[PDB]
Amino acid sequence: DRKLWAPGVVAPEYLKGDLAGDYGWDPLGLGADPTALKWYRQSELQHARWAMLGVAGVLVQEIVKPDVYFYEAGLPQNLPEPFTNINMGGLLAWEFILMHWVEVRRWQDYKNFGSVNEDPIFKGNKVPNPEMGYPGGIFDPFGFSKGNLKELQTKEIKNGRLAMIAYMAFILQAQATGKGPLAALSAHLSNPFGNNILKNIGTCTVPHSVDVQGLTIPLTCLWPGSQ
Amino acid sequence: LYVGASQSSLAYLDGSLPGDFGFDPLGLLDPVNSGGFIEPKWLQYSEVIHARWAMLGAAGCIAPEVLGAAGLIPDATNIKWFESGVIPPAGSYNGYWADPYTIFFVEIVAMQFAELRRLQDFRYPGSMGQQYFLGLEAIFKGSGDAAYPGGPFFNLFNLGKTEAAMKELKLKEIKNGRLAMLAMLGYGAQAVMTGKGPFQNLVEHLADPVNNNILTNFG
Amino acid sequence: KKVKIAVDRNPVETSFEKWAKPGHFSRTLSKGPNTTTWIWNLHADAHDFDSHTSDLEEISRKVFSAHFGQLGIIF
Amino acid sequence: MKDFTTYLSTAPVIATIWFTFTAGLLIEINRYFPDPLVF
Amino acid sequence: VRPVWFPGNPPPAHLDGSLAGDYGFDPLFLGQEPQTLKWYVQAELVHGRFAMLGAAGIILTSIGAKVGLGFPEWYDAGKVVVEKNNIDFPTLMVIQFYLMGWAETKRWYDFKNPGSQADGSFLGFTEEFKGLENGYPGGRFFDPMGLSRGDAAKYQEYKQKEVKNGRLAMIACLGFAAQYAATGKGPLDNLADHLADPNHVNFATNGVSIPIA
Amino acid sequence: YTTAIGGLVMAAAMFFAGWFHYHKAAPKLEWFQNVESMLNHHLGGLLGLGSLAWAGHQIHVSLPVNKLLDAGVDPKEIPLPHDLLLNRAIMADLYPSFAKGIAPFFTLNWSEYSDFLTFKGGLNPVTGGLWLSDTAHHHVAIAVLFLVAGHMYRTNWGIGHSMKEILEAHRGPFTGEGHVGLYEILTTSWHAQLAINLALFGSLSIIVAHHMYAMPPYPYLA
Amino acid sequence: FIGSSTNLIMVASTTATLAAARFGLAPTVKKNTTAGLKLVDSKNSAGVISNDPAGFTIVDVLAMGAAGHGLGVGIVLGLKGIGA
């Protein structure tokens, strides 16, 4: 049988190894309901892909632009040309409209599987969509799905889980030290016994609030550290 | 087995319960004409609950002083257990994220949810596994014994699969809990007597045992 | 010979059914009033626990609970 | 609840409630109309 | 089977889940009798609807008071309205009592005798006052959109939504009264003060709720 | 006000206890017939522990507060009872023996506590009542005496006394059998116990009236 | 305090009362007394088990310790009251 999440533990009845990356891990029994299990699988896939994109973006941004802090990169004054000091209202409007459209399409696909595959404007443009959360077609133009989709899906979910943990690590490292992941790694490599979680914890480098152009946005750390 | 045992207690103490050493000179587990709260199920349940709470209490009352003596935690923290905000006349800590009453209200809601659901599993065995609780009812089914519910969360690593292993671990748990209960009683008595932390009392006693004891601390 | 805690579980059910039936404690008063004398009797034998029944256990239980009621009034 | 209402319908409880109502009415009348001797 | 107020405890025998918002909550057995339960159902519905209207009005007026619109607080709106406009307070009281007396008396006698207000003795109207269920007076007047005479399942869902929103509104009105009695400010002022500093601006720091704090 | 709230809580507890003991957990007849155990508890626990607890309150609250009150200190300026119970400096200043702690009690140096445990007698010339140090020492002695008296009857071990045996052993030539059957009478009849208790209780109330007017124990009472 | 008169008197009193009950000279949990102060067998309800050959239980230790402490306290306070 497959290797579980712990030696000697017994996997739940609903976790028979059908989904990719199944380790029989469910201490809260949230997967007991099949509908809830499907929704949680979609949520896990979304979190995994978004976290992988965020981790890759933070790393590439720190490599290409080391003088820009990723935590404060959302400020309009830190945006690159020609988007510097741009109005955030129009930007939020653009993102809201586009993301709302794509997320409503994805949600409708979840509610009714295989019902929004066709393009609503140009008829005939459809995606195969063999499983929920795996549309394919235009989303996979390189044709990497015509093989062992199970092992590839396992690799995707495992890399996504690792990226989720890594992104939260980046967030807490930035909230406790005020620097990016590569900067924190270099600082720890300079003196491992002086720069670590033993001393960096308890201090919250994030300010109380920030005035984004006209309105103020409140900020806080994940733990009650010293401001 | 232990001192103070008698033939009266040995009639109903056959060794089935964990930690059964035949020590009951007051006859509190007599099943004949028993009721209310003085009955074997409630008494055993209360003993294991006190055991776990006292284990957490002993570890939490000695951890900040020990960690502060080693330099792992700063000097702002590392205060006595009775000066952390428990008893304001004895001392309080103002470094929390909110006042102790706000945190106390949060604790009221949290503890009421946990304790009331636990009580319902004791009163109605398995009743916490049917009503919707955001999918958490799958791990609140419990078992026959309210003191040992188990499940995917309460038994996370599935420890004690064998009956003998479970009995061994239960005996270890009750013994550690009884030791922790005695330790908590000693912590309170030392706090009232010496007015210092338990770790400080242990260090002072190890430095000079003849001149640092309950006899010399009377005056 | 052995001093222990001897207690019976749930002997009397908590209900308001007997609250609507005056004189239930007495066999003679449970029939109902026919004359005004009955009313006075209803108050003259309310605490006469040994007159309601001959069971010493029931009388002792009633006395012990009545003591708690008296202590509550005093408090 | 039926037994409780029947208990409340007994002579001492009814007399207590009725006398409390009558006494309260007389007290409130004498409070809003102090010292009434003649009509 | 259905979710109850306190999980694990069986619901009472007089609460079988037929009514809207039934959670088996009756520890004092106030509605144990059927007629008393029917009367209490109508009382709870009236209370919930009045609390919903009151909560919506208080929230809207507080919203207008927070922004520069000149709206007064809910605890001063009566005085502001009676003094700003030449309105006599006893006259308004009598008018409201007349209209409410007519409506409530018709509702009361319909509760005592169901369908008795449909005889046509009130200006010839018959079907507009027949009444669908207890506390649910359907018709073209009270329900002009006809949401109660179409899609029975949707009607039951709306009944559950109505009773739950009414209970929440009753709790909200009690919260408004307690917040004004303790802090002395408007509800949105309390909400803004809490959003400014939630760790130090709450009921545990107002100095009135917890006297030992 | 706090005492009134506590009294209401105690009243609720008493009513709950009566309901619980009549409808949920009712004691059996053999439980009520444990006169030896009941007498041991009433003598030691109730009377002795109550006297000891009141002696502790008098030593830690009544004595310093009343000493400052008789000295002319305003009640607002007098430290709170918990302040007196929290630090040894204030109590040591008011009573020097408090500087030694509870050490003289365990080393059998009770004479050191003579500052707050006296035999003054008479009355306080400032308040007209009995000296509170005398009342505190009185309650201490009463607590020790009642605690000793609470270990006389046999309950579950060999040590102790059996009242039936004591009653049966008292028999002279002028009274025939003696106290035979008295143990069964007092363990089966509530009216006989009520008669004895009411007689001694009324006599005690009269004794209380006499001792209270003759030796006024409260300040500004005489 | 160690070696003083109070300590020696208290230790001697406790040892004397504990040794009397163990060697059949004082009442115990197993042996009672009649009206003529003669040792007789008892009927203890607990029946405390003890590995001691004379049946000395922990209850006997507590009873003898309390009696010895009372005797020692009385002797110490009496000697302190007469100038001895």
From Swiss-Prot, chain C:
Signal peptide: none annotated. It is found in: Plastid, Chloroplast thylakoid membrane. The PsaA/B heterodimer binds the P700 chlorophyll special pair and subsequent electron acceptors. PSI consists of a core antenna complex that captures photons, and an electron transfer chain that converts photonic excitation into a charge separation. The eukaryotic PSI reaction center is composed of at least 11 subunits. PsaA and PsaB bind P700, the primary electron donor of photosystem I (PSI), as well as the electron acceptors A0, A1 and FX. PSI is a plastocyanin/cytochrome c6-ferredoxin oxidoreductase, converting photonic excitation into a charge separation, which transfers an electron from the donor P700 chlorophyll pair to the spectroscopically characterized acceptors A0, A1, FX, FA and FB in turn. Oxidized P700 is reduced on the lumenal side of the thylakoid membrane by plastocyanin or cytochrome c6. Belongs to the PsaA/PsaB family. This is Photosystem I P700 chlorophyll a apoprotein A1. It comes from Chlamydomonas reinhardtii. The lineage of its organism: Eukaryota, Viridiplantae, Chlorophyta, core chlorophytes, Chlorophyceae. The chain holds residues 11 to 85 of 751 of the full protein.
UniProtKB/Swiss-Prot annotation, chain D:
The keyword Membrane applies. InterPro entries: PSI_PsaJ (IPR002615), PSI_PsaJ_sf (IPR036062). It is a single-pass membrane protein. GO terms for cellular component: chloroplast thylakoid membrane; photosystem I. It is found in: Plastid, Chloroplast thylakoid membrane. Keywords: Chloroplast, Membrane, Photosynthesis, Photosystem I, Plastid, Thylakoid, Transmembrane, Transmembrane helix. It comes from the Eukaryota. The chain crosses the membrane at residues 7-27. The keyword Transmembrane helix applies. GO terms for biological process: photosynthesis. Belongs to the PsaJ family. May help in the organization of the PsaE and PsaF subunits. HAMAP family: PSI_PsaJ. This is Photosystem I reaction center subunit IX. It comes from Chlamydomonas reinhardtii.
UniProtKB/Swiss-Prot annotation, chain G:
It is found in: Plastid, Chloroplast thylakoid membrane. GO terms for biological process: photosynthesis. It is a multi-pass membrane protein. It comes from the Eukaryota. Keywords: Chloroplast, Membrane, Photosynthesis, Photosystem I, Plastid, Thylakoid, Transit peptide, Transmembrane, Transmembrane helix. One of its GO terms (cellular component) is chloroplast thylakoid membrane. The chain crosses the membrane at residues 1-21, 58-79. Belongs to the PsaG/PsaK family. This is Photosystem I reaction center subunit psaK, chloroplastic. It comes from Chlamydomonas reinhardtii (Chlamydomonas smithii). The lineage of its organism: Eukaryota, Viridiplantae, Chlorophyta, core chlorophytes, Chlorophyceae. The gene is PSAK.
